Copies of this chain bind each other. A is one copy, B any other.
């Protein structure tokens, strides 16, 4: 038993991390097969940060201007190109540590592990959720750009995030591995509106199920509700609307606990309308929304999904 924010083991990703330097600036790159991926603002200086012309800056560069180091071994760069906001440096050697992998663009509300890195060397690993407003709340210092987010299914690493910037609000923004930013953000040193955020309803319900499985049951009540009534409450409390697809995804947790999904929705409704009265759920004094139903099952391997 127990329930803890749990990241994926990072070994497979560690072996892909390298250090990329262009003139002054160093950040991290991801070496897969014979291509290194890194944020394109590596080719930038503070003179250029408010409105970089990335096409012109890249024209001034040549293969040998990109210093790429995998641990202690220097890599030979044989080509470069820009795809959206990432650079792809072709190297003469395929990474012998390349895992089985895919590139994926995740949906808001999905979770992933981040391997925070500096100078191509790993520093730590933690779980993030892609907020509804397409930011993440991580731990990213100077030089952490190019650190990636990922999920592991058996033996395939699905890379879904590369870190590019911290907004003036202190939250974080980045791209998929094709270089496309999550959300409306751009790679320039400017104040940028992140949309209104909201709480990931389906994740709160999954975490309430995890709590019941772990023996925390005080919030269970004698009430039920409708999807429509619940969604009225959710909208009032800045929660994401709950769809039948969400109900469907919560099915296996409903089955293990025997608590109908709409009964749990009535429990959540009461928590939102009355607060938690100073009590806790799974060690937390607020309602947690960064565990997916998948995340919960992984840590409660008693429920039946297949």
Contact = CB atoms under 8 A, between A and B. Distances in A.
Contact of A123 (B124, B170, B305): B305
A285 B283 contact: no
Interface stretch (A46-54, A174-182, A293-301): A293-301
Contact of A139 (B3, B171, B172): B3
Interface stretch (A111-119, A224-232, A245-253, A261-269): A111-119
A31 to B, nearest CB: 15
A258 interface: no
A306 B71 contact: yes
Given A2-B137, A123-B304, A123-B305, 19 more contacts: A2-B166, A2-B170, A5-B5, A6-B126, A7-B125, A7-B126, A8-B124, A9-B14, A11-B11, A117-B304, A118-B304, A121-B306, A122-B304, A123-B302, A124-B298, A125-B125, A139-B299, A141-B300, A284-B286
Contacts of A9: 10-11, 14, 115, 122-125
Interface residues of A, number: 55
Given A170-B1, A170-B215, A306-B71, A7 B124 contact: yes
Nearest to A166: B1
A242 interface: no
A302 to B, nearest CB: 5
Contacts of A7: 7, 124-126
A200 to B, nearest CB: 15
Interface string A137-175: 111111110000000000000000000001000111000
12 contacts: A2-B137, A2-B171, A6-B124, A9-B122, A10-B10, A11-B12, A118-B302, A121-B305, A123-B302, A123-B305, A125-B125, A285-B286
A299 B305 CA distance: 28
Contact of A302 (B128, B144, B303): B144
A160 to B, nearest CB: 17
A143 B236 CA distance: 44
Nearest to A275: B278
Nearest to A215: B170
Contacts of A298: 123-124
A115 to B, nearest CB: 6
A81 interface: no
A4 interface: yes
A15 interface: yes
Contacts of A170: 1-2, 214-215
Interface string A270-298: 00000000001001111000000000001
Nearest to A303: B123
